[PDB]
Structure formats: structure tokens, C-alpha cells
Subunit: 212 residues, 6 copies
């Protein structure tokens, strides 16, 4: 099973959203981290089970999240476009090294002991040190990476403390939940319930009779 | 303090979104409950504290959630536009009878004992019985109004079980949260923290130095 | 398996307790909702599993709770007997439409999506509108219906706020818990433990050696 | 403030309930613990705050719970009347040594460090050793004393595992709740709410307009 | 499977630590309860599953905790050595009557209904009465045994309030956890994970490649 | 207020424990990070409130935990001494950049937004890259730094999975708790209680009458 949109269009639209950025530090760091991690970002999945488990699923996750972030930021002008876009591209980038590969997905030792938050934080700091960038945008992106899961029980070391962090958390939940929730409702006749999914707090969903 | 958009434009946009509806039963029921509760919907606030405590705040809340629902539904074609729009309009309608008025906001006996969910379930069923509609559309709207707070600890009798119910939950969270978060960060200089807000799990927020 | 007391004696005792009522509005509304839902109240069970799963179990549940409520109201004169009796009779009425029937018990779409609480709030309000009764006893009975489970995690939208609501809670839990504990303790030799039942917080019970 | 019933009638009715017991070991042990702790049982309060804080309030607690246990035992014949009565009498006996006295009630070192449960388990075993009684009745009474608070978070070392233990817990909760709940409702006009009480999970209670 | 150290050397070391004590009351009580419960102390295990499930395992638990308590007492002079040693010896003594025996370990009715805390507190107070000791030493040891599990959810009636109670809690955690967690990593090759053990909050452990 | 031990003896004993290490990679990385952060490690405190809030408190915390880790490593030979010592030295090193200084302690933007865990993981990765060390001991130390608070609710991104991680967690608990719990008991007459300390789950502590 592959993504519905082919991979090089996803790469082109992500590069276009890089080109749309205005803050030079943000675009430089994000373009570097996408460019050096290009193949694994374009191939690897975004989890092991229950969401985005297909090949090039990370890329589809990223593109859908940027589209919905563009919608939210167009409706609410108070947000920063560039910081949000960099945070939404870079937040699940660390799973290029947490997971083993597109074939026979498995947690490696580094991702199982560390996690995709802390490995991406240190990768971001290393990129900032290499590109001779020592401004506050690095630390704010590092926070966006740090707290995109929202709460301590789900893996965040710290609660979100910036507007863009809460935006990132809500878009992540909505996108992942909608993808698994559309996958759950596919093989169900209208008027029938769905299978008991696990990552949706152990719930069963109803397809109404009027959805054709 | 009033809403930034004057009130009759909000009413015009809500009636426009009524006219955009395709399902006859949904459109008829939603138009009835909008028309009969018109003045209190256009005047009353949408809470007592920490969000939408100003006059005609319910109308701004509803219009903002319709706009963001339009964005999400345009990006995800799987959702039903009509059911989502009706669930957005009717979910905080009950606070026209839970709250006392735009002046000296206070919980009445009916709102404090019952709540804004169980009062609109009853109101929706009365509207369905009066307009001679006995379709599953009514029951799915009862679910949308029933579980829009998302979890039992926040006031939901049941967990959400339909797609538009979870979208209702997330849109309500995001709109209320970003309104209270923008109200918190208005009077804060860049590089300074904000006041410790209560509705956001007792947290503080940092305004970055590059936000002008 | 049937109830130990035959059904028309249960109906006669419930009608006698209706006749013992002194408040005209309470008596009229309660008699209407008993008379209109008579056959399903007299046939349907009171749950699906772990308690009152036999035919005419709802009637035995109601009669046993009325006996307990008569005892508690006799010892404590501060309670209102009329409101308590009505809240006892009406609180599990909703499972005439939540459940499918005495044979092959299953949750219907209305009961699974809404629940037995929110359907009886609506039914009670509709009965009040039909009998031209618009007094506060309807609202207090709606609270009794609303919060008879007591806590949010068990399905109550609001915590109890009136005395008879907490009495409804404690009589409900005591009656259901005693019946499931008696059913677990039937087939156990003294000096032996019971099966690990699920509805009692996953516990086991010891039958003492001197219980014959 | 004294109990509504004078003290010597209360001692007489407790001795009458001793006489009504049929099991010789239960009757002997319970009479021993009532006799040797007589004055402090008849004088001391049953808490420091929020319930039974008046002089001779422990006796009122015991008498009211005997009456409620008699009602529940008359309605449900499966329970053992004697062991339930002994558990009702002996469960809050330990506060004769947890509390300092009727005047200036305060926790002593033994009650604060150990608790009223573990001190009555010890007292019960010492009385059993002194009266040359080595039957399972003693151990079941020790379990009644051990788990009368129901859950670990409220002070019970173990969950209840006997029918009379759960009936002990529910009678204790209902009587303490009723006394604090009637004391909250004394000074409140009809149609007015009550003061925010602490031990009722931080709730406010409503007096309906028809209670005179 | 037996303990690595033979039993009579272990009894000799416990007797040596008894002789090391300076407080006469503590030393007398602790020697009395070691002497009278000697054979079952030297034979019985210290749990049913997941830790110290082998014969003479309770003795190994006690001896290792005395050694580690000696370490903590040597580094931290503010602790009382005698009180700590007595609390370490006597906190799992009660499982000589909770468990059935070294062969076919099973919970008896006394241990399952009551627990090893409440039976051991009673044993301590009975020995205090018999040895004609009425000092605060008995009450502080009663608290040490009462709250050695640390929290209410794990079985403690009261939270620890004395220094040696927290010390006993932490040494008990560290010793039991280290024995179960050394037993988990015995059969695991370097670079491989361990079996998902239940007593360690359902976690898995990694053996590093450089551990030979 | 200063630490009881003057500072250069603490530096000498930490350097001695560095010299006692046998693993070359561990020893090199740990000496590099101690030497580079030397002055702030020797001056800064280890928290803001409730523990180690005095000047040079980090050094005293580190020295006491090394002594206790030496005790545990001597008693339990299965542990790795070098990895444990490095994890004990480096776990609160990040507070040289989280905190402002020994005078007027306050959280900086980096420490408050990120935390001392994720800063120190990044510093470990940078030190490994600079010293040209790319072996798994870096990753195991990174996990030691990551999970030394033990649970998600206290700030750990991941649960501990290596033996030295659980040992580091327990020694951190014991040392911090003991210093705050000795500080609470200094000004209390024997036979009197202590003030309710916040960091110990709001408990009150008793000083026994026989402690002189
Ligand atoms: Mg993530
Ligand atoms: Mg994502
Ligand atoms: Mg709402
Ligand atoms: Mg809303
Ligand atoms: Mg119910
Ligand atoms: Mg019921
Ligand atoms: Mg009690
Ligand atoms: Mg009581
Ligand atoms: Mg234990
Ligand atoms: Mg132990
Ligand atoms: Mg730390
Ligand atoms: Mg530390």
C-alpha cells in the first residue's frame, strides 16, 4: 500500500512551502534538515501501528498537516506562518532514525531508548551549531519539537508554552485521528458499527445510514 | 466590550451557511432552532469565565467555528458538511437558557442542575416532533450536541462515536483555546511571560522576542 | 429465568405506591410515564450483563428499590417521599428504548449513541409539555433522572445536587451490587471463594464457613 | 451542641441490639468491647470536622446505623444480622483513642500515626485472646473493621470481600453523608443554594422551592 | 531453587545485628519475635509471584535489606540504626502466617482477607503486652510496619510519617526490584531485550552489548 | 548558607571518582563535561525551591549520590560502576544552564521552556561528536540522563529501561528527599510535628520523643 499522491509531488509541495517562508533562519535550518534527511523522509512511515503505517506515509502526514496548518493560519492572522511550517515539517522527522525502514518496521535501540522527540531536538541543535545560527528561533523550534505530543502521559517532557505548539499538537491529533478513523470506517456498511480500534481510547464508531 | 464584527453580518453569514445546506431535514431543523432562539443567540455570551465572556460572544464563536469547519471539510472530503455545520451551530445553543443574560452573567437553576447539553437534546427532539421529522438525522444531531465536550470528565454523557462528533470536539477546543490564548498574550511585551491562566491546565505562555 | 415474584403483583405494588403519592404533579407525570411504557417496563431487563439480565428484571429492580426507599424515608423524615419514589420509578425507564427486548438483549442505535439518561430527560420534558405542567418539580425530576449514576466516569453529565439524587445514587448502587453479589455467592461451598466478577472492581468474595 | 436523643436511652438501645444477637461469640466479644470502652464510646465525637463533630456524636452514628442496618437486613434476608450489627458497633470504636476527647478534639499521636482501623483490629484480637475465643467470627469481624472505608484512597488497607463489609461501607457513607448534608441545608431559604461543602467532593446543593 | 547463601549463616548474621542494637526495648521485642517465629522465618518465601518466590527467600530479602540499611545508616548519621534494623527485620515477618508454606505457596484466608501489615501490627502489640513494654518504641515500630509499602494504592493504610518509615519503603522497593530485575536479565544475550515483566509497571529492559 | 563541606574537597573527590573509572569512553566524556562546565557545576544550586537551594548545592548533591552509589555498587556486584558514576555526575549538570546563578535563582528561557534533561542530552551528543566517540556508551548515558526522574508525570520523556537508570532514579529520590526531610526536622522539639512540606506530597512528619 502506497500513498494516494505520488512521492515527488509531495517533495515539490514541501519545497514550495519552504520557498514561501520569510524568516531566513527558519528557512535555512528547515531546508538543511529536509535536504540531508531527504530519502528517509520520503520513504519511511510515521509510526509502527494504528496510523500512517504505509510506505511514504510520513510524507503524506506532512503534506496534509501543512495544508491544514495553512487553513488555520489563514483564518487566524495572529499565528506565525514560518515557525508553524518549520515545526510541522520537523516534528516527526526524527522517526527517520527511530524506525528501521519502510520494510519490516521495527523500533531500533536508539529510538526505543530515546524517542523521536529528543533525537530530533539534538539533531536540530547540531544543525544550528553547524549553520552558525545562534538566535532564539532555534530554541522556539526546539520547543515545538519538544512538546508536540501535548501532555506528559503521551511523551512530552514539557507542556506546550507557545501558541504554535498548541496549534501543532491539535493538527497532529486531528490529522492522525482522521486518517486512522477513515481507515476504520472504510469496510463498514452504512447502518453498521466499526471494529473496536485501540488508539482512539478503545471506542467503536457508527456509520450512519445516509452516508453513501 | 463587544465582538469585533457587528452582529447583523454574523447573522447574515450564519443564514448564508443555512442556505448552503443540501440535506432538507438538517436545514429545516437548524433554521427552526436558529429562528426561534434568534435574539438570545445573537446577544448572550458563550461562557461565564475564561472564554467568550463578552456580549455577542456566542455569535463570534459560532461564526469562527463555521469558518474553520469549512476549512477542514474542504481539505477532507470524507466528512459531511451539512451535519458538521448543524452540529457547530447547535452545540452551544443551550447557553441561551443556561445563562441569565448579556448583563450580570450567572448560571440559572435549569442550567446549573441540567447543563447545556441535556437541554438541547430535549429542545432538538421537541423541534423534530413539531416539524414531523422522524429520521436518523435527528438522532445523529442529538449525538453531536451530546458529546461535543469530548470526554466524561468535562461534561460529556457519552464518548463521541461519529466522525463529525470528534471534529466538533476538536474545533470547539481549538476555537475556545486560541481565543483565550490571544486574550492572554495581548498585554505582554515580547520576551516576557503571560499571566498564569486557569482554563489551560494551569500553565504560562512565552511570547517570543521576534513577534512584533 | 424469571423474577421470583410474579409480574402483576409487581405492577399492583407499583400502582399502590403511585396512589400513596401526595404531590399532584409528581403523581400525574409518574402515572403517565408508567402507563404509556407499561408493557416494556414490565417485560424488559434492566441491563445487558452483570446484573438484572433476566426477564422482568426491571420490575424487580424498581420494586426492591421502592422497598429500600420506603425504609430510608421512614428513618429520615427530612427526605421528600414523593420525589424520591418518582425518581426511583423513572430512572431506569429509558432501557425500554435503550435495549432491544427480553429476548436477545442488545443495545439499539438510540441507546448506544445517547444513553438511558438523556432519553428519559427528553421523555419527561415531553410528558410535562403534554400534561400542561410547567412547575419546578419537572426540573427536579429531570435532575434525578440526570445524575442517578453519580459520577462523570460512570455516565452522569452532572454531579448530584439535591438530596434525593444522592439517595437515588446510593439505593441504585446498593440494590444492583447486592443482587450481583448474591448471584456470585449462590454456587459456592462455605469456606470457598467466588469467581472474580467484573462489575465489582474486579474483586473476589469469601463465603464464611458458618453461613449455612 | 448535644445529640437530639439523650445518652442513656442510646446506651439502652445499643444494649438491646446486643441482646438481640444470636451468635454467642459475636455477642460476647461485642458486649466486652462496649462495656470496657463504655464512657468514651458514650462521650467522644466521631470525627474532628465535617461530620459528627458534636459531643456524643459517635453514639448517634452507631444508633442511626443500627436502625438502617436493621431495615436493610429485614428487606434482604441473605445478610447475617448479628455480624452486621457487631461491625456497625465496632467500626468507629477506635476513635475513643484516636481523638483526645469531647472538648478540644484533636488527633493524638497513636490515632494520627496508626489510625482507628489498625488499633481496633489489635483491640479485637486482644479481646479474643482474653475471652478464649479462637473462631473465624473474630477474623471476619477484623475484616469488617479493616475495610469499612471501602477503598485504598480513603484509608482501607484491603478492599471489602464479604457481603456485610460492603453493607457496612454503604451504611457508613449514607449516614455520614446524611448528617453533613442535613447540616448544610438547615440555614438555607427555599430556592437558594448552600455553602460549598468540602467532604462531598466539593459540591454545592440546591434546596427546591417546594420544601417547607 | 534455594538461596545462594545457606540458612544458618543467615540466621547468625541476623542474630549478630540483633546483638548490635543498643536500645533495650527494641532489641528485646525484635529478638522475641525472631525467636518465636524462627522456623517459618527461615523457611517461608516473601511473596507468591515475581519476587522472592524461592525457599528461604524471605531470609535473603531481610539480610540484603539489613546490609543496605547498614550502608545508608553509615553514610547518613541522622538516622536511628536500631529502629531501622528492627523495622527491616519485622516488616515481612507477618507473611509467615499470610503464606501457606515453602511448598505450594498460596494465600491463606487470614493473609488474603487481612494482609501482612495488620496481622503483624497485632503481633507487635501482643508481644508488647506480654513482655511488659509500654514505650513509644512499640508505636513507632507499629508505624514502620504499618506504612512500609509507601502509598495507599499498594497497601499502606497510612502514608509514612517517620524517617525510618521512608527508609524502609525505599530499601524494600530497591531490594525487591533489584531481585526481580536481576532475574529478568539472566537469560538475555547482550544487545537483546528482556521479557515484559509485570511487577515493573509492564516494562521491558535492555542489556547493553558491553556487559559481559 | 553554604554546604557543610568546602568546595575544593568536593572537586577533588569527584576527580578521584573520575580517576577510578575503567571504561575509557565513559571516563573521557565525563571528564570533558566536568572540565568544561567546572565553575558553574561548583557554584550553582540544584533546584529553585524545596531541595538543594543553597550555594554549591549541586556539588554536595553529586558527592552524596556518588557515595551512596558506591555503597549500592559494592553490595550488588551486577551493576556497572563506571556507567553509574557518570550518570550520577551528569544528570543534574544541565541546571548550570537552566538556572540563572547562585544569587537570585530563577529559571531562564532555555531551562523553563526545555528542561535540564533535553539540554544535557544535546550536550552529551555534542561532546561525543567533538571527542570522536561513536560507541553505544554515549547512547546508554543519554538514556540515563533522559529517564532519571523515573516517570512521565515528573518530567521523564521515557520510562527507565536499563539497570543504572532505575538505580540513578532511586538514589536521586533518596538524596533529595533526605536533604529536604532533614531540613524539615531541624527546628522541631521531640514530641512535636513538622510543617507540611510541599515536595513530600504535603505530609507532616513526627519527631519521636527518644531522638536527642
Ligand atoms: Mg510525535
Ligand atoms: Mg505528525
Ligand atoms: Mg459546550
Ligand atoms: Mg462551542
Ligand atoms: Mg442508570
Ligand atoms: Mg436502577
Ligand atoms: Mg472509619
Ligand atoms: Mg461510622
Ligand atoms: Mg510488605
Ligand atoms: Mg520487604
Ligand atoms: Mg533532574
Ligand atoms: Mg539529582
Amino acid at each position: 500500500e502506497t500513498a494516494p499522491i505520488p512521492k515527488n509531488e509531495m517533495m515539490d509541495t514541501i519545497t514550495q512551502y519552504i520557498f514561501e517562508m520569510k524568516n531566513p533562519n527558519i528557512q535555512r535550518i528547515t531546508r538543511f534538515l529536509v535536504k540531508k534527511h531527504e530519502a528517509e523522509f520520503m520513504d519511511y512511515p510515521a509510526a509502527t501501528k494504528n496510523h500512517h503505517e504505509f510506505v511514504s506515509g510520513l510524507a503524506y502526514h506532512v503534506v496534509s498537516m501543512l495544508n491544514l496548518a495553512k487553513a488555520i493560519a489563514d483564518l487566524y492572522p495572529s499565528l506565525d506562518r514560518d515557525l508553524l511550517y518549520a515545526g510541522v515539517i520537523l516534528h516527526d522527522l526524527g522517526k527517520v532514525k527511530e524506525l528501521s525502514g519502510p520494510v519490516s518496521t521495527s523500533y531500533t535501540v536508539e529510538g526505543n531508548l530515546l524517542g523521536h522527540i529528543s533525537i530530533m531536538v539534538t539533531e536540530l541543535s547540531k544543525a544550528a551549531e553547524e549553520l552558525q545560527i545562534d538566535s532564539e528561533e532555534v530554541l522556539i523550534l526546539q520547543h515545538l519539537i519538544l512538546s508536540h505530543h501535548g501532555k506528559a502521559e503521551w511523551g512530552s517532557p514539557k507542556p506546550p508554552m507557545v501558541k504554535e505548539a498548541e496549534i501543532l499538537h491539535y493538527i497532529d491529533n486531528l490529522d492522525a485521528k482522521m486518517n486512522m478513523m477513515d481507515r476504520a470506517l472504510e469496510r463498514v456498511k452504512p447502518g453498521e458499527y466499526t471494529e473496536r480500534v485501540f488508539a482512539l481510547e478503545n471506542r467503536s464508531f457508527y456509520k450512519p445510514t445516509f452516508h453513501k
